[PDB]
Motif scaffolding. Structure first.
Motif, mmCIF file in Angstrom:
data_model
loop_
_atom_site.group_PDB
_atom_site.id
_atom_site.type_symbol
_atom_site.label_atom_id
_atom_site.label_comp_id
_atom_site.label_asym_id
_atom_site.label_seq_id
_atom_site.Cartn_x
_atom_site.Cartn_y
_atom_site.Cartn_z
ATOM 1 N N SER B 59 58.242 -2.061 -27.269
ATOM 2 C CA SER B 59 58.191 -3.508 -27.277
ATOM 3 C C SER B 59 56.762 -4.032 -27.117
ATOM 4 O O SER B 59 56.127 -4.375 -28.113
ATOM 5 C CB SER B 59 59.082 -4.065 -26.177
ATOM 6 O OG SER B 59 58.826 -3.393 -24.953
ATOM 7 N N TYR B 60 56.247 -4.061 -25.891
ATOM 8 C CA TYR B 60 54.965 -4.731 -25.637
ATOM 9 C C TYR B 60 53.769 -3.935 -26.148
ATOM 10 O O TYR B 60 52.651 -4.474 -26.245
ATOM 11 C CB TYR B 60 54.792 -5.059 -24.143
ATOM 12 C CG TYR B 60 55.824 -6.038 -23.660
ATOM 13 C CD1 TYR B 60 55.775 -7.375 -24.052
ATOM 14 C CD2 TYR B 60 56.882 -5.625 -22.863
ATOM 15 C CE1 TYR B 60 56.728 -8.265 -23.646
ATOM 16 C CE2 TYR B 60 57.836 -6.515 -22.445
ATOM 17 C CZ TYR B 60 57.757 -7.835 -22.851
ATOM 18 O OH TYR B 60 58.716 -8.722 -22.432
ATOM 19 N N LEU B 61 54.009 -2.664 -26.469
ATOM 20 C CA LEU B 61 52.998 -1.811 -27.071
ATOM 21 C C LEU B 61 53.267 -1.625 -28.563
ATOM 22 O O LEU B 61 52.569 -0.865 -29.224
ATOM 23 C CB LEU B 61 52.977 -0.447 -26.386
ATOM 24 C CG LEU B 61 52.654 -0.508 -24.900
ATOM 25 C CD1 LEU B 61 52.755 0.866 -24.287
ATOM 26 C CD2 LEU B 61 51.271 -1.081 -24.680
ATOM 27 N N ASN B 62 54.285 -2.312 -29.077
ATOM 28 C CA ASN B 62 54.704 -2.188 -30.482
ATOM 29 C C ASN B 62 53.828 -3.074 -31.365
ATOM 30 O O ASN B 62 54.121 -4.254 -31.593
ATOM 31 C CB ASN B 62 56.178 -2.595 -30.610
ATOM 32 C CG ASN B 62 56.784 -2.305 -31.996
ATOM 33 O OD1 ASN B 62 56.097 -2.270 -33.014
ATOM 34 N ND2 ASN B 62 58.099 -2.107 -32.019
ATOM 35 N N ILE B 63 52.742 -2.501 -31.868
ATOM 36 C CA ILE B 63 51.761 -3.286 -32.612
ATOM 37 C C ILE B 63 52.346 -3.969 -33.855
ATOM 38 O O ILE B 63 52.116 -5.165 -34.058
ATOM 39 C CB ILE B 63 50.532 -2.438 -32.994
ATOM 40 C CG1 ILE B 63 49.690 -2.149 -31.748
ATOM 41 C CG2 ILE B 63 49.690 -3.174 -34.031
ATOM 42 C CD1 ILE B 63 48.610 -1.107 -31.970
ATOM 43 N N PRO B 64 53.089 -3.222 -34.695
ATOM 44 C CA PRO B 64 53.642 -3.883 -35.877
ATOM 45 C C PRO B 64 54.563 -5.043 -35.550
ATOM 46 O O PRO B 64 54.527 -6.024 -36.280
ATOM 47 C CB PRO B 64 54.430 -2.765 -36.576
ATOM 48 C CG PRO B 64 53.762 -1.537 -36.169
ATOM 49 C CD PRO B 64 53.273 -1.762 -34.763
ATOM 50 N N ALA B 65 55.372 -4.938 -34.502
ATOM 51 C CA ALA B 65 56.318 -6.007 -34.167
ATOM 52 C C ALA B 65 55.606 -7.264 -33.643
ATOM 53 O O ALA B 65 55.963 -8.404 -33.977
ATOM 54 C CB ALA B 65 57.324 -5.510 -33.153
ATOM 55 N N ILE B 66 54.577 -7.065 -32.839
ATOM 56 C CA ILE B 66 53.831 -8.204 -32.330
ATOM 57 C C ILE B 66 53.122 -8.954 -33.479
ATOM 58 O O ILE B 66 53.167 -10.202 -33.573
ATOM 59 C CB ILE B 66 52.860 -7.736 -31.249
ATOM 60 C CG1 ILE B 66 53.664 -7.370 -29.998
ATOM 61 C CG2 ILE B 66 51.858 -8.814 -30.935
ATOM 62 C CD1 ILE B 66 52.889 -6.685 -28.914
ATOM 63 N N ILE B 67 52.496 -8.192 -34.369
ATOM 64 C CA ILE B 67 51.812 -8.774 -35.520
ATOM 65 C C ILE B 67 52.822 -9.505 -36.408
ATOM 66 O O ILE B 67 52.544 -10.589 -36.924
ATOM 67 C CB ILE B 67 51.073 -7.691 -36.347
ATOM 68 C CG1 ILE B 67 49.798 -7.242 -35.640
ATOM 69 C CG2 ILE B 67 50.748 -8.192 -37.768
ATOM 70 C CD1 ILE B 67 49.039 -8.343 -35.016
ATOM 71 N N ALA B 68 54.003 -8.913 -36.563
ATOM 72 C CA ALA B 68 55.041 -9.512 -37.394
ATOM 73 C C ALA B 68 55.530 -10.829 -36.807
ATOM 74 O O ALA B 68 55.865 -11.743 -37.552
ATOM 75 C CB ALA B 68 56.209 -8.548 -37.590
ATOM 76 N N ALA B 69 55.572 -10.924 -35.477
ATOM 77 C CA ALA B 69 55.947 -12.165 -34.799
ATOM 78 C C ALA B 69 54.911 -13.271 -35.072
ATOM 79 O O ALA B 69 55.256 -14.437 -35.305
ATOM 80 C CB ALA B 69 56.092 -11.927 -33.275
ATOM 81 N N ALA B 70 53.636 -12.894 -35.044
ATOM 82 C CA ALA B 70 52.585 -13.824 -35.433
ATOM 83 C C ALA B 70 52.745 -14.301 -36.880
ATOM 84 O O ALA B 70 52.582 -15.485 -37.170
ATOM 85 C CB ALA B 70 51.213 -13.193 -35.216
ATOM 86 N N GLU B 71 53.081 -13.380 -37.786
ATOM 87 C CA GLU B 71 53.183 -13.717 -39.200
ATOM 88 C C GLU B 71 54.328 -14.696 -39.455
ATOM 89 O O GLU B 71 54.144 -15.742 -40.084
ATOM 90 C CB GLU B 71 53.354 -12.436 -40.029
ATOM 91 C CG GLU B 71 52.067 -11.614 -40.134
ATOM 92 C CD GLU B 71 52.232 -10.295 -40.885
ATOM 93 O OE1 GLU B 71 53.317 -9.677 -40.796
ATOM 94 O OE2 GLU B 71 51.263 -9.876 -41.562
ATOM 95 N N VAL B 72 55.508 -14.366 -38.950
ATOM 96 C CA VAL B 72 56.701 -15.151 -39.228
ATOM 97 C C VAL B 72 56.690 -16.516 -38.546
ATOM 98 O O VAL B 72 57.287 -17.465 -39.070
ATOM 99 C CB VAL B 72 57.991 -14.394 -38.839
ATOM 100 C CG1 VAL B 72 58.174 -13.169 -39.732
ATOM 101 C CG2 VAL B 72 57.972 -14.000 -37.384
ATOM 102 N N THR B 73 56.030 -16.625 -37.387
ATOM 103 C CA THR B 73 55.901 -17.931 -36.740
ATOM 104 C C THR B 73 54.741 -18.767 -37.281
ATOM 105 O O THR B 73 54.616 -19.949 -36.961
ATOM 106 C CB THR B 73 55.762 -17.784 -35.206
ATOM 107 O OG1 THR B 73 54.615 -16.981 -34.893
ATOM 108 C CG2 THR B 73 57.002 -17.125 -34.633
ATOM 109 N N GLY B 74 53.891 -18.157 -38.099
ATOM 110 C CA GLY B 74 52.720 -18.844 -38.614
ATOM 111 C C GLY B 74 51.715 -19.117 -37.506
ATOM 112 O O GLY B 74 51.015 -20.125 -37.527
#
Lengths: 414, 414
Positions: B59-74
């Motif tokens: 979760s909190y170390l999951n780089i792709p997921a964190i970046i993806a959250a930034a992308e989808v929320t703009g």
């Protein structure tokens, strides 16, 4: 010096006093009614004494019982907080005559500033500006200038009639006045200081809701003038302890209306912008010590705001007693929370409805306001109604945001 | 500028960041594990996104997921807090390469100060004092002077042998060193400031327990010297954002050991004595703005202390996860409470055990300490064990009261 203090009050101010005492290593005696056995400060106090049943008249206003609690505990001093007996000169006179230190002014000074006209007359003698005021009542009314108050009066053909009616049951009336008040301290070493001012114009039925410091628009020149006049008034009347001079403020001029000879509810906003601990100074001054700083040491830094959080319906203002099933209090940088309420506490019907004071600080008024809005949004008081929604309405009001709203503004807005 | 920030963290620091964002009018995106759905900052955030199951690695170390959250929320930017990915240069490099603003230094600077020796070498180049240090290993050991570290070494006949063993798996070792650290900010306009120092010597197994500011004994002359060296180091290495230079401090001399290239857990004590909001400055600096003040504007006033309140047994230090059935947090003048915990919240097993930071301020160290003791006495955390009893032991320790205890002191005392 002072080794043991009876806290002759309740609720948040009682806790505020207990905290100051404990910092100074002063033992505490919590006197309380039967209804207040679970108050936070009672639970934290070194000794407790039940002084009567729930009604204030039988407990917190019970002079013999409070004095008796001081006697039996071997206390040195009594702190009356605000309200209740704090400005009762008979209480002060009896505390002194009975060998205890009253944490406040002398009885004689209380009585002097306790009476409407004698107060105004001592201030006028002192050089503190008062409101223009007091059948040659038409001549006086005329020179003062309508509108007037005896019942308000907007013209002379009604004067006479009004006079006879206001009796059986005169300050120039102002209509753009703000409530601006000067905090002072005076000690037994002949010193007296002013601690900037507070604006407390947001009021309902003459009860303050939101306070701030410093007052918007007040320059330091103006602060220095009115503040110096208040300090000199302190010396001239032999004042002792914390006090507040309340003024109406308009078109750049101040007009005295009342002195509260005790600590103020809204003292925290002054603490935030000056770094002074006003209750600790009360205790030190009562012990005979000098004020811990000189006038030149005081400089206003930043801005502070206070919201009085009350257990009441936010539109009808009817009290909302009951069990707080959940409390979540706000925090973080520039947030101060002064409250005796805790999760599981039952707010009783018998007293005032204040349950907390939320205080914020910021480098600017704008920052203090935004921090207050955010802190209010984080606050949860589950089980009872509060006036938090009213605070939110006030804080987002464009005129409040601009600053400088007068004492009639809230009631007009609603 | 920055309109929307992903808070790539959890617990108290996530709430701290959310509060700063909300003050600046920045929208928030709370990324969280399945276990953290009830975190306070998640409940307050504008948008939420679940980024994985409970374990940090997922979760909190999951780089792709964190970046993806930034992308989808703009989102425009990502704030990594402390710990987790905040000093992971691969994460920073990927946040930038992916078009978002990393609220922190550039990847290259992270990597530079992320490596033991390269850091020390950049500092030595910069003029920041480092520890004397790095078969001609007897000659080097000799000039440096025992004791030494390769495994510690108190003499030369063991040197050789030690060398071969520390390998398969040299800073002069000091024995009266305090942990003294300098807070800095650097912006994209070429400015860099120091914000006095903190003493964080009270440690167990290299984990800080209590911190304070300023550091006892440090005069302003000394502050100005070491602080100016750190600021210049910032410029020399092209630092950006908040950071801390950690030193060992002894017989009046400083010795660099590490730079944390992120916000510090104990940043609040610095806020209390300088009036700077360090997280707001991180956000402004990341948006491209200058630091909101100049070095001459900063002056240490008073003293502050912080106790890290942890859900753990106060003697064994084993974690104490569970439901907080009742929380009562302290308040009043000079008390600051930074915590995500609320009554009814369940502290989970999956992460660190910190549940709150209690921070006090006073005009003197003595006042800050007494205020901490009183605040701790008011604090109630029912349902789980905390380290509050350890704090109470520390605060009443005569050597801590005197000030200046070294980094080995706590473990010796227990």
């Amino acid at each position: 010096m002072l080794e043991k203090v009876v806290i002759a009050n309740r609720g948040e101010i009682a806790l505020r006093i207990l905290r100051a005492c404990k910092e100074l290593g002063i033992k505490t005696v919590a006197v309380h009614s039967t209804a207040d056995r679970d108050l936070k400060h009672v639970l934290l106090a070194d000794e407790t004494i039940c002084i009567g049943p729930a009604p204030s008249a039988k407990s917190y206003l019970n002079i013999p019982a409070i004095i008796a609690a001081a006697e039996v505990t071997g206390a040195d001093a009594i702190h009356p907080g605000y309200g209740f007996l704090s400005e009762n000169a008979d209480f002060a006179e009896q505390v002194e005559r009975s060998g205890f230190t009253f944490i406040g002014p002398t009885a004689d000074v209380i009585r002097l500033m306790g009476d409407k006209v004698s107060a105004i007359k001592a201030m006028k003698k002192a050089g503190v500006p008062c409101v223009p005021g007091s059948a040659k009542n038409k001549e006086i009314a005329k020179r003062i200038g309508y509108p007037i108050i005896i019942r308000v009066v907007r013209s002379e053909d009604a004067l006479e009639e009004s006079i006879a009616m206001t009796k059986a049951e005169m300050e120039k009336y102002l209509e753009n006045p703000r409530h601006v008040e000067i905090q002072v301290l005076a000690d037994t070493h002949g010193n007296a200081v002013y601690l900037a001012e507070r604006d407390c114009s947001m009021q309902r039925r003459h009860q303050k809701v939101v306070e701030e410091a410093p007052a918007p628009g007040i320059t330091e020149e103006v602060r220095r003038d009115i503040g110096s006049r208040c300090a000199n008034a302190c010396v001239e009347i032999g004042y002792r302890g914390a006090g507040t001079f309340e003024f109406l403020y308009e078109n750049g001029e101040f007009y005295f209306i009342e002195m509260n000879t005790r600590i103020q509810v809204e003292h925290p906003v002054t603490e935030m912008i000056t770094g002074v601990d006003l209750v600790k100074e009360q205790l030190r001054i009562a012990a005979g010590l000098p004020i811990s700083f000189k006038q030149e040491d005081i400089k206003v830094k930043g801005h502070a705001m206070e919201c009085r959080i009350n257990a009441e319906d936010p539109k009808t203002f009817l009290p909302s007693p009951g069990k707080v099933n959940h409390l979540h209090s706000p925090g973080g940088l520039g947030v101060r929370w002064d409250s005796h309420v805790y999760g599981g506490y039952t707010v009783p019907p018998h007293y005032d409805s204040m349950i907390a004071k939320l205080i914020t600080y910021g480098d600017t008024r704008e920052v203090a306001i935004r921090r207050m809005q955010n802190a209010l949004s984080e606050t949860i008081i589950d089980g009872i109604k509060t006036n938090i929604p009213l605070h939110e309405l006030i804080l987002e009001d464009e005129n409040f945001q601009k600053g400088g709203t007068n004492i009639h503004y809230l009631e007009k807005k609603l």
